[PDB]
């Protein structure tokens, strides 16, 4: 298959959050069939970022998902042509983010072009005050609608102090060619910043994801 057991990653993200505009570039590697990937991220414009890096990281590719043989792999089937996605992120305090990604491959390496945009984040909330610690692990409900794959997941940021900051993800996954469509299933996620420098200009990011029926 064109998706090899080990695939490299390259990405570029341009965006703006509450007016502050930025550019982040990424280099990485992962095992698509194990559902594990690691990314080395770099802020190229807009350092230091005035908002919590956590809101960006799920925007930094469901091809890195361990899929059982009995579930069609919508994402691995889309290649080499690739796929794109569109995501809305509705936070509980009316903060709101919109993101898109265009994913292709070349050789042993994925490429992403990411756009990220957010606004109406309260000036004293956790995102603008950088009071987030991590994303809790989550479960995304995948299901086919309008000939394309859709995913919904309830997300929550653990805050400094112990409380939680909840967000609603709704994503549309559009393959660039015809692929065998699966029925409803779930993807378990865990995303983690392994290491970072003081202002998060250098960040190392890890995700593990596996698909399964309910």
């Amino acid at each position: 298959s064109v998706i090899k057991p080990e695939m490299k990653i390259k990405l570029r993200m341009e965006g703006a959050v509450n007016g502050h505009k930025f550019v982040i570039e990424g280099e990485g590697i992962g095992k698509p069939y194990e559902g594990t990937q690691t990314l080395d991220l770099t802020v190229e414009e807009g350092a230091p970022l005035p908002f919590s890096y956590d809101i960006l990281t799920p925007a930094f590719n469901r091809a890195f998902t361990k899929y059982p043989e009995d579930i069609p792999d919508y994402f691995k089937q889309a290649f080499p042509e690739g796929y794109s996605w569109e995501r809305s992120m509705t936070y509980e305090d009316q903060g709101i983010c919109i993101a898109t990604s265009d994913i292709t491959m070349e050789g042993d390496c994925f490429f992403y072009e990411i756009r990220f945009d957010g606004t109406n984040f309260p000036p004293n909330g956790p995102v603008m005050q950088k009071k987030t610690l991590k994303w809790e692990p989550s479960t995304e409900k995948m299901y086919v609608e309008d000939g394309v794959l859709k995913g919904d997941v309830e997300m929550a940021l653990l805050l400094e102090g112990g409380g939680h900051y909840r967000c609603d993800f709704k994503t549309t996954y559009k393959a660039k060619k015809d692929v065998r469509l699966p029925d409803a299933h779930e993807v378990d996620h865990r995303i983690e910043i392994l290491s970072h420098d003081k202002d998060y200009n250098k960040v190392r990011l890890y995700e593990h994801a596996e698909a399964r029926y309910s």
Partner: nanobody, 118 residues
Amino acid sequence: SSSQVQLVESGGGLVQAGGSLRLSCAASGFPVDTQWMHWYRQAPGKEREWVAAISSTGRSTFYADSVKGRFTISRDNAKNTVYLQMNSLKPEDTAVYYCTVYVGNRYRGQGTQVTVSA
């Protein structure tokens, strides 16, 4: 197949170290703004080296770490052409340069030669 997509490179030649050179990759058979496109180079004897890449929308550009800062990839959608601007050339940049694209199948140019003198 050559009546489906064609990539035609040009702009190569010989130049002295520290010089400049601007390659062109003229596309035919598909709109250049609908596909990611890459530049490869291949010295004789050694393996091919991925040089640079540009996205469908042209808002993203990627370069190998061996030519960053010096090489620039750009695009003109009206002329349907991808360009590779090469500054501060070094004798190790000596290879045949070609562009490549995937539109249902893999297409590749014939390549233009760049030879850098010491």
